[PDB]
Design a protein around this ligand. Structure first.
Ligand SMILES: [Cl-]
Ligand code: NA
Length: 129
């Protein structure tokens, strides 16, 4: 599923992301835009053999199992395919775990390089929230 900007905002708000660990809604929408272009089906393979999955590009090295990343962990306890679903519940739940692990949203490279320090509120502006 390819979300609209406001549609995803509303979805993330419903799932408890707005102000989660101090990060306003705009930060999550911004990260999703640059990580996956709002496409729940986005996959990208990394040099190390791991793959990033879904709307927030969560990595199979630590967070989910895809049966092809040797010596990896599954800290979200889910198959990585579950992060590609049109329902973002699994991705949200797992992202909450990642952002709590000490490094905040810095775990998302696109957030650090393209959202952090920017007017992220602009990503939810005009939405009925
Ligand atoms: Cl933080
Ligand atoms: Na894994």
């Amino acid at each position: 599923k390819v979300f609209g900007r406001c549609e995803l905002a509303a979805a993330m708000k419903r799932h408890g992301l707005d102000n989660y660990r101090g990060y306003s809604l705009g930060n999550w929408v911004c990260a999703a835009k640059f990580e996956s272009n709002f496409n729940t089906q986005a996959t990208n393979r990394n040099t190390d053999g791991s793959t990033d999955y879904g709307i927030l590009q969560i990595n199979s090295r630590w967070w989910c199992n895809d049966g092809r990343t040797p010596g990896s962990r599954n800290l979200c306890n889910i198959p990585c395919s579950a992060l590609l679903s049109s329902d973002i519940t699994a991705s949200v739940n797992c992202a909450k775990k990642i952002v709590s692990d000490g490094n905040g949203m810095n775990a998302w490279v696109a957030w650090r390089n393209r959202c952090k320090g920017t007017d992220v509120q602009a990503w939810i502006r005009g939405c009925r929230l």
